[PDB]
Amino acid sequence: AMGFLILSRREGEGITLSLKADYPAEELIRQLREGGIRILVTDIIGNQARVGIEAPRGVLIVRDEL
Amino acid sequence: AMGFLILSRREGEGITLSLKADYPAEELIRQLREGGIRILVTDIIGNQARVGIEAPRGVLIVRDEL
Numbered sequence: 001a002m003g004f005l006i007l008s009r010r011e012g013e014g015i016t017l018s019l020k021a022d023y024p025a026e027e028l029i030r031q032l033r034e035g036g037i038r039i040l041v042t043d044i045i046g047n048q049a050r051v052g053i054e055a056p057r058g059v060l061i062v063r064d065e066l
Numbered sequence: 067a068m069g070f071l072i073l074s075r076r077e078g079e080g081i082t083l084s085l086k087a088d089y090p091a092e093e094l095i096r097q098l099r100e101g102g103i104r105i106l107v108t109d110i111i112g113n114q115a116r117v118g119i120e121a122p123r124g125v126l127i128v129r130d131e132l
Binding site: 009012014015017018025026028029033036037038040041043044047048049051052 | 075076077078079080081082083084085091092094095098099102103104105106107108109110113114115117118119
């Protein structure tokens, strides 16, 4: 969609996607209907996988470490 | 959340997440607020990364090949 993030992940490491409290309801739905959420494996380097996530601004992307 | 899928992905290979037409609006929002979407790198084997996706039933998970 709009926002962009690439992060390295190893085995057992993960990401959680959620909705922002501040944005309204119906507009996130429509975004997610128009622009989907795109997940991409860009490179694999050794024990590290680099994962791209492209999602609308209303979506919060959070590494599981937190 | 509820649904579960693990798929192998190599460099440049990706996945698109969207909302199902058939499910209503407000209940998917709440799911995505209660159960988020969980993305996990389970194993890295060579040129292949295995990616787990855990999401509510209202979310459609689609390999980019299609």
